Amino acid sequence: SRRRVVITGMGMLSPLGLDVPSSWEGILAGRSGIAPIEHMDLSAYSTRFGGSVKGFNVEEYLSAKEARKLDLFIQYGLAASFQAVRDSGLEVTDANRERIGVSMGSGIGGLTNIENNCRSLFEQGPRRISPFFVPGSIINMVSGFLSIHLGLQGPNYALTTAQTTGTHSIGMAARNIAYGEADVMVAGGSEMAACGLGLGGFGAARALSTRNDEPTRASRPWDRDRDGFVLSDGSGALVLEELEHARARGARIYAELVGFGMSGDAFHMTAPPEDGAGAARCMKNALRDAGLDPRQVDYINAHGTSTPAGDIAEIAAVKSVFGEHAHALSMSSTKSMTGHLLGAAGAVEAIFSVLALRDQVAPPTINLDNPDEGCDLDLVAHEAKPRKIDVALSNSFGFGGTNGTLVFRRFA
Amino acid sequence: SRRRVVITGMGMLSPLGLDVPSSWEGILAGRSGIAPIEHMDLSAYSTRFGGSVKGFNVEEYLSAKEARKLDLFIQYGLAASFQAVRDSGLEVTDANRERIGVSMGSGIGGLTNIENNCRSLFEQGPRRISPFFVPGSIINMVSGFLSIHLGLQGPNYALTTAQTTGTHSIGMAARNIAYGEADVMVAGGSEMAACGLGLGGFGAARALSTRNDEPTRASRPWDRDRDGFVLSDGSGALVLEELEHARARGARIYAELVGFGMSGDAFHMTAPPEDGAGAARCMKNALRDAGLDPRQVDYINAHGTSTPAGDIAEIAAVKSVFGEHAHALSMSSTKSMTGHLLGAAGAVEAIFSVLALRDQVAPPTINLDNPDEGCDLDLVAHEAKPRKIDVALSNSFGFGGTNGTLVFRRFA
Numbered sequence: 022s023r024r025r026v027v028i029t030g031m032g033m034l035s036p037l038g039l040d041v042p043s044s045w046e047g048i049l050a051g052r053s054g055i056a057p058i059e060h061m062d063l064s065a066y067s068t069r070f071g072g073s074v075k076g077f078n079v080e081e082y083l084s085a086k087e088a089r090k091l092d093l094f095i096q097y098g099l100a101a102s103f104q105a106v107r108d109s110g111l112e113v114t115d116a117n118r119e120r121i122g123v124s125m126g127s128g129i130g131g132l133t134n135i136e137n138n139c140r141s142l143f144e145q146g147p148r149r150i151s152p153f154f155v156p157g158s159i160i161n162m163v164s165g166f167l168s169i170h171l172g173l174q175g176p177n178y179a180l181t182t183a184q185t186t187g188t189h190s191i192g193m194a195a196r197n198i199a200y201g202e203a204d205v206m207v208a209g210g211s212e213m214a215a216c217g218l219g220l221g222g223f224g225a226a227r228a229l230s231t232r233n234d235e236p237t238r239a240s241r242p243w244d245r246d247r248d249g250f251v252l253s254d255g256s257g258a259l260v261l262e263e264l265e266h267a268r269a270r271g272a273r274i275y276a277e278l279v280g281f282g283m284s285g286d287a288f289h290m291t292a293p294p295e296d297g298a299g300a301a302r303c304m305k306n307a308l309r310d311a312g313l314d315p316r317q318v319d320y321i322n323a324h325g326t327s328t329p330a331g332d333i334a335e336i337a338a339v340k341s342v343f344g345e346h347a348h349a350l351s352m353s354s355t356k357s358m359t360g361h362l363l364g365a366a367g368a369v370e371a372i373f374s375v376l377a378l379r380d381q382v383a384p385p386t387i388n389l390d391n392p393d394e395g396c397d398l399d400l401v402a403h404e405a406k407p408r409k410i411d412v413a414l415s416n417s418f419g420f421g422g423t424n425g426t427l428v429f430r431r432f433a
Numbered sequence: 434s435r436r437r438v439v440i441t442g443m444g445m446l447s448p449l450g451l452d453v454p455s456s457w458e459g460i461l462a463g464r465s466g467i468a469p470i471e472h473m474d475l476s477a478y479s480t481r482f483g484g485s486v487k488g489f490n491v492e493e494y495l496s497a498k499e500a501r502k503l504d505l506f507i508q509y510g511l512a513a514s515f516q517a518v519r520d521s522g523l524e525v526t527d528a529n530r531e532r533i534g535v536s537m538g539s540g541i542g543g544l545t546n547i548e549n550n551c552r553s554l555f556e557q558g559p560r561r562i563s564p565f566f567v568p569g570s571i572i573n574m575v576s577g578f579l580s581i582h583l584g585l586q587g588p589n590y591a592l593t594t595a596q597t598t599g600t601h602s603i604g605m606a607a608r609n610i611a612y613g614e615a616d617v618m619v620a621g622g623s624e625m626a627a628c629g630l631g632l633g634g635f636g637a638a639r640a641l642s643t644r645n646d647e648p649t650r651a652s653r654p655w656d657r658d659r660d661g662f663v664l665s666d667g668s669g670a671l672v673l674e675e676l677e678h679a680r681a682r683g684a685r686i687y688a689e690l691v692g693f694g695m696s697g698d699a700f701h702m703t704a705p706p707e708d709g710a711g712a713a714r715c716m717k718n719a720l721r722d723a724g725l726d727p728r729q730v731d732y733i734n735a736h737g738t739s740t741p742a743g744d745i746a747e748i749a750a751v752k753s754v755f756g757e758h759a760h761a762l763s764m765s766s767t768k769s770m771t772g773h774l775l776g777a778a779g780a781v782e783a784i785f786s787v788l789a790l791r792d793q794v795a796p797p798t799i800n801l802d803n804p805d806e807g808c809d810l811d812l813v814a815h816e817a818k819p820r821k822i823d824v825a826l827s828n829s830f831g832f833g834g835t836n837g838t839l840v841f842r843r844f845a
C-alpha cells in the first residue's frame with residue numbers, strides 16, 4: 022500500500038550558481054544568470070546569449086580520465102546527483118544498495134558531443150569518431166554512471182519528455198518509492214543544448230528571444246514585450262526517500278512530495294492550447310493525488326517560459342483550476358532569472374519550490390514591467406515576497422503536449 | 434492491491450517484415466533480415482551491413498508533408514503504434530480519452546535528422562537548419578504525435594534506457610495501468626541508427642560484428658565465432674489494457690503481463706558482469722513481481738546480442754536463477770535473425786514472447802553452429818521448437834548496466 026515520500030537531499034548547477042545555496046541566493050536577490058555566450062562564436066545566429074553554467078569545475082566531482090569521456094550534460098547531471106547524495110547524508114551499503122535507484126533525464130542529451138563527432142565524420146571519416154561517442158552522449162548515462170560510481174542497484178532509468186523531463190523524472194521516481202519498488206531514488210534532469218545545433222535549431226523555429234542587446238531583460242514571463250524563451254544549461258537532482266526510511270536514519274527532511282499529475286494536451290507538436298486545458302487537467306490530477314482542497318495551494322512555480330502562447334495558457338489554466346483562489350496564491354517564473362533549462366527546468370524548479378517552503382518566500386518574476394492582457398494574478402513582479410507557504414506546486418509543459426505537476430508541502 | 438494487465442494489440446516494423454505476422458513468419462522460418470546497407474557509401478567503415486526496414490511506406494500512416502517533419506525513428510514508432518491500436522479494436526471517446534496514454538521510447542533517437550541538419554549547419558550556417566529539427570527529432574515525439582493524432586489525454590512520456598528502452602517502456606506502462614493511473618497504454622520503442630553516426634559510433638567502440646562477407650551469419654548468439662552485435666532498425670508497439678476493461682468490450686486478449694523487473698548492474702558503462710549478477714537480480718525481481726517460482730518459466734527470449742561478454746553473462750544469470758530447471762526451459766535470441774534494434778529490441782522481443790505463447794513454439798537461435806564453452810542450455814539452435822509454453826520471459830540489458838525483464842503468461 023502507498024508509502025509517503027520526502028526530500029532529504031538536493032543538488033544543482035544553474036546559471037546563478039554551482040550549487041543549491043548560491044543559486045537560491047541569486048533567485049531571492051532577483052539576479053539574472055543570462056549573458057552573451059562565450060564558449061562559441063554565434064555571430065551568424067539570431068540569438069547569441071543564454072544561461073551558461075559559469076566556472077564549472079568537473080575536477081570537484083570526476084577524474085579528468087572519466088570526465089573527458091562525457092558530454093557536459095552528463096557532467097552537470099553527475100555534479101547535481103553527487104551534491105544531492107552528499108546533502109542527504111545517505112550511506113550506501115550492501116544492506117540497502119538494491120533499494121536505491123536513479124532517474125536522471127534530459128530533453129536533448131549530448132548534442133555538443135554529437136555535433137563535434139558529426140564534424141569529425143564529415144571532414145575526416147568514421148575512424149575519427151570517439152570510441153566514447155555513444156556512452157558519452159546517450160541520455161541514460163547520468164543514471165548509468167551515477168549507479169556505477171555509488172553502487173546503486175535499484176531501478177535505473179531515464180525519461181526524455183522535452184521541457185517536462187525533470188518534473189516527470191521526480192514524479193515517477195516518487196511513484197517507484199510510493200509503490201515499494203525502491204526506498205530511495207536520485208531523480209531530476211540535466212541539459213547542455215548550447216551548441217550550434219541547439220541555438221540554431223530553436224532559432225530556426227523562431228522560439229527564442231532575440232533580445233541580444235539586453236540579455237538580462239530577455240526572459241520576461243507574462244510581460245507584454247516577451248519574444249520567446251532563453252536557452253539555459255544546468256542540472257537539478259533530489260534524493261527522494263520513503264518517510265519511515267528517512268525517520269529511521271534521522272534524516273533531515275526538507276519537505277514532503279504529496280502529489281504528481283501528468284496529462285497530454287493532444288493539441289499540437291509544439292504549441293500549448295490558448296485555454297491551458299491540458300495544464301489544468303494535469304494540475305487537477307496532481308491536487309487529487311495529494312488529497313488537497315485547491316485553496317490549500319499557496320505558491321506555484323510556473324513553467325513561465327516567456328513565450329507569447331505558453332505564458333497566457335498558464336494564467337488560463339490556473340484561473341480554471343483555482344477559481345477565486347487564483348487571486349490569493351502567489352505564482353512566479355524563476356525562468357525570469359535562470360532562463361529555460363529544458364529537461365533540467367523541472368528539476369531546478371522543484372528544488373526552488375522546496376526552498377520556497379523552507380524559507381516561506383515566493384521568488385520573484387523579474388522583468389515583469391507591463392503585465393500582458395489577462396495576466397492579473399499575483400505574479401510576484403520584480404521582488405521576492407515573504408508569505409505563508411504550506412503547499413507549493415511546480416508545473417512543466419513540453420513539446421508533444423506533455424504536462425507534469427508536482428505538489429510539495431511542509432513536513433513536521 | 435493491483436489490477437491485471439493484458440495485451441490486446443501489437444504492431445511492428447522489423448528487418449523481417451512491415452507488420453507483426455510477416456515478421457513472425459520470418460522468425461519461425463529462421464530467416465535473416467541482415468544485409469549490406471543500401472543508398473549509403475560505407476567504404477570507409479569497418480561494418481557495411483545491418484537490419485534495415487525494407488519497403489516502408491510512411492504515406493500509409495501520414496501525409497507526405499507531416500512525414501517530412503519527422504525523423505525515420507518517429508515514423509517507425511508511429512507505424513507500429515497505429516498498427517497496435519488498429520489491432521486492439523479500441524474505440525477512443527470523450528468518456529475514455531483521459532484514461533489512454535502513450536510511452537514509446539528510443540535509445541539514440543533522431544541520428545539521421547542530426548546528420549542532415551549538421552550537414553546544413555557546417556556547409557551553409559544555422560539559418561538552413563530545419564524549423565522542425567527539434568520537435569521532429571526528440572524522442573518523446575512518437576508519444577506526442579500519437580496522442581495528438583488519436584486524441585489521447587492519459588499519461589504521455591518516453592523512456593530512453595539504451596538497449597533496455599522497449600522493455601522498460603512496456604513494464605512502466607503496465608505499472609501505470611496496474612496502479613490505476615490509466616486503463617490503456619500504447620508502449621514500446623523505435624530506432625533508426627543506420628546513419629554514418631550509428632555505424633561509425635558503435636564501430637569506434639569495436640562493438641559491431643565486421644563479418645561483411647556473410648552478413649546473414651554475422652549475428653550468432655552463444656556461437657564461439659561471434660564478434661559483436663548487428664545494428665538494426667524498426668519498432669514495436671503493444672496495446673496494454675486493464676483486464677476488466679478488455680473483457681467488457683470483448684477485446685481479443687493475446688496474453689497477460691504478470692511481472693516486470695528492473696535492476697542496475699552498477700558494474701560498467703558498456704560491459705555486463707561475466708557472472709550476470711544484474712540480469713539474475715532483475716529476473717528474480719520480475720518473477721517475485723509475478724508471484725511465480727523459477728520452475729514455472731518455459732521460454733526466455735534472451736537479450737542475446739552476439740557480443741562475447743553479454744551472451745556468456747546471460748547463460749550464467751539463467752543457471753543462477755533457475756538452478757535444476759535451467760535446462761528444461763528453452764531460451765533463444767531472435768537477434769540471430771533481426772539483429773539488435775537497440776531501444777526497439779525489447780518491444781519487438783516482447784511481441785515475439787507473446788506470439789511464442791499464442792503459437793506454443795520457441796523461435797530459433799539461428800547461426801548457433803558451435804556453442805561456446807558453458808553454452809550448454811537449450812538455446813533452440815537452428816530451427817523453431819514447438820513446445821509447451823505457459824510462462825515466457827523477455828530480458829534486456831543495456832549501457833549503464835540497466836536491466837529489464839518482462840514476464841508474460843497464457844490467458845484463458
Ligand SMILES: O=C(c1ccco1)N1CCN(C(=O)C2CC2)CC1
Pocket residue numbers: 039040043081082103104105107108
Ligand atoms: O556536494 C558536493 C560534492 C559531492 C561530491 C563532490 O562534491 N560539493 C562540493 C563541490 N561544491 C562546490 O564547489 C560549491 C560551489 C562551491 C558543492 C558541494
Ligand SMILES: O=C(c1ccco1)N1CCN(C(=O)C2CC2)CC1
Pocket residue numbers: 128129130131132135154155158159160218540541542543544547566567570571572
Ligand atoms: O533528442 C535529441 C536531439 C538533439 C537535437 C534534437 O533532438 N537527442 C539526440 C541524440 N540522442 C542520443 O542518444 C545520442 C545519439 C547518441 C538522443 C537525444
